[PDB]
Specification:
The protein is mainly beta. The protein has one helix at 152-161; strands at 6-9, 14-19, 25-29, 34-39, 44-51, 59-69, 72-81, 85-93, 103-110, 113-125, 132-141, 148-151, 168-179, 182-189. The longest helix has 10 residues, at 152-161. Pathway: Glycan degradation; xylan degradation. Keywords: Carbohydrate metabolism, Glycosidase, Hydrolase, Polysaccharide degradation, Xylan degradation. The active site is at residues 86, 177.
């Protein structure tokens, strides 16, 4: 509620807010499923509310406003362990296209749009377990939106048949991620 980086609960919802230490972000937990993040000349941060652990069949609802001014993402975001996987199903984003860099593996239609499916590999990056090497799986929504429902099952199933296995689920969050930019977002999860 103007919280510094951390993990916890605040009315049945798990929250996770991570940043690289750069100034510029203010993350506020609101009641229940709500949080606000406002950032001006940020570094890299990831902030959001949801579930710990997540599930391979959750259908996640979100509303509110997302107003990026530069490099940012609004995604269903989470991790799995063994294998260590960072995954993103991106609903909307700013000036930087998330697929830059990626290998396209396929497509899937869910909740009103087809999404393009990509795999990237992070080498010696922070993870949930500390500095690690891991694959990053992405579904990018062609038709961008700031509110809706996501049936996660569709994405995890598509990923599976393109050969992108997932281990045991860690947290599963609706997150706004920023990379050295500015913006505003107020979102509510359910």
């Amino acid at each position: 509620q103007t919280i510094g980086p951390g993990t916890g609960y605040s009315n049945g919802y798990y929250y996770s807010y991570w940043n690289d230490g750069h100034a510029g972000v203010t993350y506020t937990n609101g009641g229940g499923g709500s949080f606000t993040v406002n950032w001006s000349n940020s570094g890299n941060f990831v902030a959001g509310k949801g579930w710990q652990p997540g599930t391979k069949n959750k259908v996640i609802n979100f509303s509110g406003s997302y107003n990026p001014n530069g490099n940012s993402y609004l995604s269903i975001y989470g991790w799995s362990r063994n294998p260590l996987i960072e995954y993103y199903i991106v609903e909307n984003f700013g000036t930087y296209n998330p697929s830059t860099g990626a290998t396209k593996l396929g497509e899937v239609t869910s909740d009103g749009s087809v999404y393009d499916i990509y795999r990237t590999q992070r080498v010696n990056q922070p993870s949930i377990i500390g500095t690690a090497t891991f694959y990053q799986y992405w579904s990018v929504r062609r038709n961008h939106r700031s509110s809706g429902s996501v049936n996660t099952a569709n994405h995890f199933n598509a990923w599976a048949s393109h050969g992108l296995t997932l281990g045991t689920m860690d947290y599963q969050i609706v997150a706004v991620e920023g990379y050295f930019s500015s913006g505003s977002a107020s979102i509510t999860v359910s």
